[PDB]
């Protein structure tokens, strides 16, 4: 079109991938044509054609793609062919792109070494990929694998340059010249940068210096590689590791104090159900990390209408509703758990997010006189009484795993003291009922 958004445009991601491929062609093929003799005049036109195609990609990015990138300075600026372009020209991205497009004709591939300086496009494409692509540790694995492959690629080109500098086959250390040059130099790079060893030992001073530096860089690059993979796996499995650590700490706590297998099985069932359904052990730790507006809006979009459906809170101010939505505590109940007991006093209101509850009564109990599905509210009358003079009329069991919200007393009071008008409303509602 005429003005694209770099943050959320898939076409811009595709073009940035094309720029990444051009930059990758430059980075991966400059040392090949510098060291290996793969730029013979028989096929030099192919190299020139692909270099000029990558330069055309660079020119298209610097002219008709990076100039029309909208930004924010307090508001979205989509001024086509105005200060939207001027922000790009004042940015370091334009300076790096123009420094990366330095024209050196003079056929030495090192003159194309400025083309490797368009690395900001690669980082921008990466940052778009942790956004638009879920399960982003796969791309990070691919990226660190490509980093290792490029390090071995550079080491193979360096080894071939060292071999040709001393002459091929002049010593057992250098590349002899038999077979595919890139594959065997890459074999040397693998045996070296991973510090596997097993290579013919260096003889001359230049060979020993090269092998020393290549083993030192290999030890550090192998450490970088193993640390990167450890970080990727630790971040990708951070939630699973944390859940397993908490569950195993709980299990060893119960095994320390000889908790019976019924309670242990119930706690393990809660842990597995909470991890499988919720995806996290406590949603409140996530909610307190958020900004207050995001947390409030998420409480709205979860259960605002369900809370507003009850007649007790109708007629009160909406800000108290917002506050109690912020203060609702979501808890799951295992099957056949007593959510309410007949003798137990009432303190809290239950709002079923999911699951079914059953109210027991009649002769000797064991009779479902009413079942409540998801979205129902029971236990609200306990919110009306003050001083603790409330009790549940009948015991309520959870028929299955029931995720439900809690509004306990002294929290509703804690937000009642904030709103005196709602305080009078709930006082008269308690006196009426």
């Amino acid at each position: 079109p005429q003005s694209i958004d770099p943050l959320t445009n898939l076409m811009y991601v595709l073009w940035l991938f094309f720029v990444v491929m051009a930059w990758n062609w430059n980075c991966w093929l400059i040392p090949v044509r510098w060291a290996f003799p793969y730029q013979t005049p028989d096929n030099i036109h192919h190299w020139l054609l692909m270099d000029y195609l990558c330069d055309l990609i660079y020119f298209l990015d610097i002219t008709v793609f990076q100039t029309r990138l909208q930004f924010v300075r307090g508001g979205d600026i989509i001024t086509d062919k105005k200060d939207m372009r001027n922000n790009y020209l004042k940015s370091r991205r334009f300076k790096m792109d123009l420094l990366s497009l330095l024209p050196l004709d003079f056929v030495n591939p090192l003159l194309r070494l400025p083309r490797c300086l368009k690395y900001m496009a690669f980082f921008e494409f990466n940052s778009r990929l942790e956004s638009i692509l879920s399960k982003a540790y796969v791309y990070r694995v691919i990226r660190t694998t490509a980093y290792l492959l490029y390090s071995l690629h550079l080491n193979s080109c360096l080894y071939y340059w060292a071999s040709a500098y001393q002459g091929l086959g002049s010593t057992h250390w250098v590349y002899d010249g038999v077979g595919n040059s890139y594959i065997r130099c890459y074999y040397f790079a693998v045996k070296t940068l991973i510090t596997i060893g097993g290579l013919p030992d260096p003889k001359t001073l230049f060979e020993i210096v090269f092998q020393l530096l290549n083993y030192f860089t290999g030890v550090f690059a192998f450490s970088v590689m193993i640390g990167q993979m450890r970080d990727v796996v630790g971040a990708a499995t951070a939630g699973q590791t944390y859940y397993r650590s908490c569950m195993d700490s709980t299990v060893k706590y119960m095994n320390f104090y000889k908790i019976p297998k019924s309670v242990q099985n119930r706690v393990k069932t809660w842990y597995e159900y909470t991890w499988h359904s919720q995806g996290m052990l406590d949603e409140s730790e996530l909610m307190v990390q958020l900004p207050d507006k995001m947390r409030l809006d998420l409480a709205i979009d979860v259960n605002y209408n369900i809370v507003s459906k009850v007649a007790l809170f109708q007629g009160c101010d909406r800000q108290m509703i917002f506050d109690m939505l912020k203060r609702l505590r979501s808890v799951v109940y295992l099957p056949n758990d007593y959510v309410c007991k007949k003798g137990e006093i009432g303190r809290e209101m239950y709002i079923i997010q999911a699951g079914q509850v059953q109210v027991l009564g009649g002769p000797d109990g064991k009779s479902v006189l009413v079942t409540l599905k998801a979205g129902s509210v029971f236990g609200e009358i306990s919110l009306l009484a003050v001083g603790g003079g409330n009790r549940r009329t009948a015991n309520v069991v959870a028929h299955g795993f029931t995720n439900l919200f809690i509004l306990d007393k002294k929290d509703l009071n804690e937000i009642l003291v904030h709103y005196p008008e709602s305080q009078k409303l709930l006082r008269k509602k308690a006196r009426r009922m």
């Binding site: 290792l148 077979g179 595919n180 594959i183 890459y186 074999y187 693998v190 045996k191 991973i194 510090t195 596997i196 060893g197 097993g198 192998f222 193993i226 993979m229 450890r230 796996v233 630790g234 590791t241 397993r244 650590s245 908490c246 569950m247 195993d248 700490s249 709980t250 299990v251 706590y253 119960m254 320390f256 104090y257 019976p260 309670v263 119930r266 706690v267 393990k268 809660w270 842990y271 597995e272 909470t274 052990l281 406590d282 808890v331 799951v332 109940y333 099957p335 758990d337 003798g343 006093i345 999911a354 699951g355 079914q356 998801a374 001083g387 603790g388 959870a398 795993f401 029931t402 995720n403």
Partner: protein, 450 residues
């Protein structure tokens, strides 16, 4: 009908299906690459393959009869279970794994057992059984380490098979890199074949070398790719085992790091050697008596119901002796057993002093305490386990001599574990329970008048 996934029957069948899946994932590639292994014991492989296929059919039967969880309730309707199973990609994987490819034994020959490589598509049963096992077992970290070790073993075995098959494709003994000629008596043995292939695979996947270098370009490519597979996949699982072993001692390392930070603090601020020795004595007591773990941080995710039941089961005997619990209306305890916080006191600690603000109530989990005199040498009476005190100053009382201040000083002889109970928590529990308030006020009056 209906099998419950959380039941023992489902886990037993998970083991009974993991056995053929492990058998496939090892022996299918083992027989495909090592031709002598397939040819020598072909009757045993036929019996085991038929048994594994039967178990695969019974596993698909179970997957039509296992109940899923809809709105928290187990589904017993057979049509819903069948439709749910067939809607999933697991049904496609099972169908792909149980296409009869053994008919190609009559077309390709008996020496091509890779035709049942599709039986490897039952890997989800393996992974489900391993996820279910670590939840049930009492040694989850040990099982996770063994599972990753198993993963290392099967990857080494697969690379051994791939190396032997690549040597077969190039030709045995054509150069030094490949497996030697089969006509050699030492290297023609099946055990030597598999074991030397395993040795090559172990040396390459661990990035050791010490094997004959490649000669042909395809061998160079395979060696490079296998070293890369041993650096990005094998080293990852090795680091995963290291991380599991680190997670075994995560609480131990956290406690030791806290001790080390405190000791560095005492070293820099020139704390006296006696105080450093007694801090070290406190930490040695903490580790020796197994009190390094706090139930508040471990159980913080659990609900009030489950924390309440666990805390009653842990503290049953010590809460039996407490007078307000199980002797009064006894509905109070569930509200307070969540609210009790454990504290540990060294010998000679003064938990409260006369003229000090009493904002908290103590219930003795264990330890000998003493209502000491003003100087402290004389002890009026010794409080045992299950005793509770500090209730006089925590509440307003009729005829209060001092009010909001401790009336006696109590010191712990020996170590002591106490259930601290704050004033706000006690008032939260007691504003709704007037009988316990009356009983506690009477108990406070009985000592306060005297």
């Amino acid at each position: 009908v209906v099998i419950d996934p959380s039941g023992n029957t489902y886990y037993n069948w998970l083991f009974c299906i993991t056995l053929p899946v492990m058998y496939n994932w090892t022996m299918v590639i083992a027989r495909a690459c090592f031709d002598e292994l397939q040819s020598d014991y072909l009757e045993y492989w036929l019996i085991l393959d038929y048994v594994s296929d039967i178990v695969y059919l019974i596993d698909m039967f179970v997957r039509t009869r296992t109940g899923y969880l809809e709105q928290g309730l187990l589904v017993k309707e057979e049509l819903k279970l069948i439709n749910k199973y067939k809607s999933n990609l697991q049904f496609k994987l099972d169908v792909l794994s149980l296409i009869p490819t053994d008919l190609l034994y009559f077309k390709l020959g008996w020496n091509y057992p890779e035709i049942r490589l599709n039986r490897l598509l039952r890997f989800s049963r393996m992974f489900e059984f391993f996820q279910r096992t670590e939840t049930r077992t009492n040694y989850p970290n040990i099982f996770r380490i063994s599972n990753l070790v198993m993963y290392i073993v099967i990857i080494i075995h697969w690379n051994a098979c791939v190396f032997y098959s690549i040597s077969k494709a190039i030709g045995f003994g054509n150069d030094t890199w490949v497996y030697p000629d089969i006509n050699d008596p030492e290297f023609g043995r099946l055990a030597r074949k598999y074991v030397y292939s395993l040795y090559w695979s172990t040396l390459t996947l661990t990035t050791i070398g010490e094997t004959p270098p490649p000669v042909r370009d395809s061998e160079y490519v395979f060696v490079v790719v296998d070293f890369l597979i041993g650096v990005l996949i094998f080293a990852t699982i090795v680091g995963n085992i290291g991380s599991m072993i680190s997670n075994m001692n995560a609480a131990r390392a956290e406690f030791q790091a806290r001790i080390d930070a405190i000791k560095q603090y005492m070293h820099f601020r020139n704390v006296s050697k006696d105080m450093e020795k007694r801090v070290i004595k406190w930490f040695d007591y903490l580790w020796t008596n197994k009190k390094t773990v706090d139930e508040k941080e471990v159980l913080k995710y659990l609900p009030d119901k489950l924390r309440a039941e666990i805390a009653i089961n842990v503290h049953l005997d010590t809460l039996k002796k407490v007078r307000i619990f199980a002797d009064c209306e006894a509905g109070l305890l569930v509200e307070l057993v969540l609210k009790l916080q454990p504290q540990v006191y060294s010998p000679g600690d003064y938990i409260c002093k006369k003229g000090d603000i009493g904002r908290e109530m103590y219930i003795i989990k264990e330890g000998k305490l003493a209502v000491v005199a003003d100087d402290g040498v004389t002890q009026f009476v010794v409080l045992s386990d299950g005793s509770y005190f500090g209730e006089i100053s925590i509440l307003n009382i009729k005829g209060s001599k001092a009010g909001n201040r401790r009336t006696a000083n109590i010191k712990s002889i020996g170590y002591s574990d106490l259930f601290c109970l704050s004033k706000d928590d006690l008032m939260e529990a007691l504003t709704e329970y007037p009988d316990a308030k009356t009983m506690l006020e009477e108990k406070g009056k009985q000592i306060l008048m005297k």
